[PDB]
Amino acid sequence: TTFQYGDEGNRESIKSFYSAAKNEKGRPIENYAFMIVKPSINGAMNLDVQNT
Amino acid sequence: PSANPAKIFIRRLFNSGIAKSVVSYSNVMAAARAMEHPVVFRCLDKLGLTVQSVKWYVGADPDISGTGMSAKERKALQQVLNRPNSAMSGAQLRYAATLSWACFGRMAFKVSVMGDGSVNAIWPLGIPFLKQEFNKYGEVTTFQYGDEGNRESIKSFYSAAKNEKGRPIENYAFMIVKPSINGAMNLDVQNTPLQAVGMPVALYNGLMERALEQCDGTPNSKWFVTAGRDIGEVQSKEIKDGIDDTKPGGDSAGEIIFVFGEDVKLQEIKNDLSDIHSKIPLDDQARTIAGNFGIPIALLGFAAADGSKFASNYDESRKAFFEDTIEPGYLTPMEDGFSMFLCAPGSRVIFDRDSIPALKKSRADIAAVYEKVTFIDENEKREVTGWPKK
């Protein structure tokens, strides 16, 4: 739902693509962020098990 | 339903109404440590990338026809196949399926269907967290997913209610299995390479641990000196200060050592670490591990002493690896399972084999030869080289 960027004192909050408000055609109308993930064995979708 | 011979086993091994784990804990632990190994991880990544490189599509069945999905339905299913859900694309789904197949020998997915039966999303399931239940006739009836206090219950493709055409009208799940010698498949008997790579991995790890331990504990000295007892309380310091001054950057670097009136013995120490890691057995274990997975060692990047004696070039190995391992091992099971559990009869999911980069040169060279033959129709020439019929 939200991406938090920065340290505890200077953090910045960014809305995710899914939670961002969208127009009639489904495209966002405000700033947002997104991330890409490499799959792993456990099948967890977007959880912290890296594959590098 | 009573005709199934599988009832012999599931009355013994799997009591009705009790969910049992798909895989044993030892297999899960073996899979978990594989990803952190400098050899097995490379093989798994190679297989995953090679399998994901291949695209598929939805097409018509060439042998059995009639009552298949129309063009609209096939194009609708194409969208789901290209974008399975909101977080994974087709390539990532292929990667996860390939890893599951390579490690545990089985793969499962959950499929979401709308009211009219058309699919809208697909999700992968982790084999370690999956449990299944059987009726008294031996057919799976329910898939149990998750921990004891957070169970997610899913009905199997067989038990799900279906419309007039036999397609499910509610969420369901399905699993694919690799045959074993005993017969019945849905039992807790597996078929994976990891069964047979125990001793190689253990010996490799032991040898590397010994190498590190020797590296971190062997004295780093080059030669060793002894002296007699008849040396004063000070001349002994003078001797060492004289020897130390011949170090690089010293006041007497590069000069000779002249000791007057003492029997200072000198012995030289040769620390031979050239075989710290046991090169030969360590390479043998790597070759065995690579072989059991069906990957030519040349592609993995590890060296071998006889590459040219078998494989004339690198492209031949690249082509042979695909044609002999990827096609019959990984592509065919996924293809058959998806065609069985997603598409109605008369249609099929088809991988695009001929378009892979590795086979372009040969695919053109062979095609240029049939151009000369004349006792074959144009349609037959097109069929034998992979192109569709006009």
B24 token code pair: 């044993």
Residue A37 burial (CB < 10 Å; 0-12/13-18/19+)? middle
Cα separation of B76 and B336, whole Å? 20
Cα separation of B355 and B103, whole Å? 28
Beta strands in B115-262 (DSSP E): 119-125, 130-134, 140-145, 152-155, 172-177, 223-226
Nearest to B50 by CA among B374, B321, B303: B321
CB-CB under 8 Å, A39 with B99: yes
Q: Is the dihedral of CA B124, B126, B129, B131 positive or negative?
A: positive
B334 token code pair: 């996924």
Q: Which residues contact B103 (CB under 8 A, 6 or more apart)?
A: A41, B31, B34, B44, B127, B192, B194
Alpha carbon separation from B188 to B127, B192, B374 (Å, rounded): 12, 13, 55
Minimal-distance CA residue of chain B relative to A43: B126
Distance from A39 to chain B by nearest Cα, in Å? 6
Residue A22 burial (CB < 10 Å; 0-12/13-18/19+)? middle
Q: Which of B87, B88, B99 sits opposite A41 (nearest CB)?
A: B99
Cα separation of B110 and B83, whole Å? 15
Distance from B138 to chain A by nearest Cα, in Å? 27
Cα separation of B187 and B23, whole Å? 10
Strand partners, B226: B265
Q: Using an 8 Å Cβ cutoff, are B155 and B145 in contact?
A: no
Q: Using an 8 Å Cβ cutoff, are A43 and A34 in contact?
A: no
What residue has token string 């995953």? B48
Q: How many CB atoms lie within 10 A of CB B153?
A: 12
- Residue B138 CA from chain centroid, whole number: 31
Q: Is the dihedral of CA B101, B186, B131, B343 positive or negative?
A: positive
Q: Which residues contact B369 (CB under 8 A, 6 or more apart)?
A: none
B37 token code pair: 């190994």
- Give chain B positions within 8 Å (CB) of A42: 126, 128-129
Q: How many CB atoms lie within 10 A of CB B46?
A: 17
For residue A33, what is the DSSP state?
Answer: B
Alpha carbon separation from B325 to A21, B184, B188, B192, B309 (Å, rounded): 47, 25, 25, 14, 22
Cα separation of B88 and A39, whole Å? 9
Long-range contacts of A41-49 (CB under 8 A, 24+ apart): A41/B31, A41/B32, A41/B35, A41/B99, A41/B100, A41/B103, A41/B126, A42/B126, A42/B128, A42/B129, A43/B96, A43/B100, A43/B124, A43/B125, A43/B126, A43/B127, A44/B126, A45/B87, A45/B88, A45/B123, A46/B87
Cα separation of B280 and B283, whole Å? 5
Distance from A16 to chain B by nearest Cα, in Å? 12
- Could you tell me where the DSSP H helices lie in chain B? 7-10, 25-34, 40-52, 71-82, 90-104, 198-215, 235-244, 279-292, 297-300, 307-310, 315-321, 332-341, 360-370, 378-384
Q: Please state at what angle helix B279-292 crosses helix B40-52, rounded to 10 degrees.
A: 30
CB-CB under 8 Å, B126 with A42: yes
- Give chain B positions within 8 Å (CB) of A38: 92, 95
B56 token code pair: 């598929």
Reported as type and span, the H/E element at residue B58 is strand B56-60
Nearest to B288 by CA among B192, B365, B164, B196: B196
Cα separation of B361 and B258, whole Å? 74
Cα separation of B284 and B39, whole Å? 12
Cα separation of A16 and B123, whole Å? 21
Q: Which of B88, B99, B103 sits opposite A45 (nearest CB)?
A: B88
B372 token code pair: 């000369």
Long-range contacts of B51-55 (CB under 8 A, 24+ apart): B51/B94, B51/B95, B51/B97, B51/B98, B51/B326, B51/B330, B51/B331, B52/B91, B52/B92, B52/B94, B52/B95, B52/B98, B53/B356, B54/B94, B54/B326, B54/B331, B54/B351, B54/B352, B54/B353, B54/B356, B55/B90, B55/B351, B55/B352, B55/B355
Minimal-distance CA residue of chain A relative to B99: A41
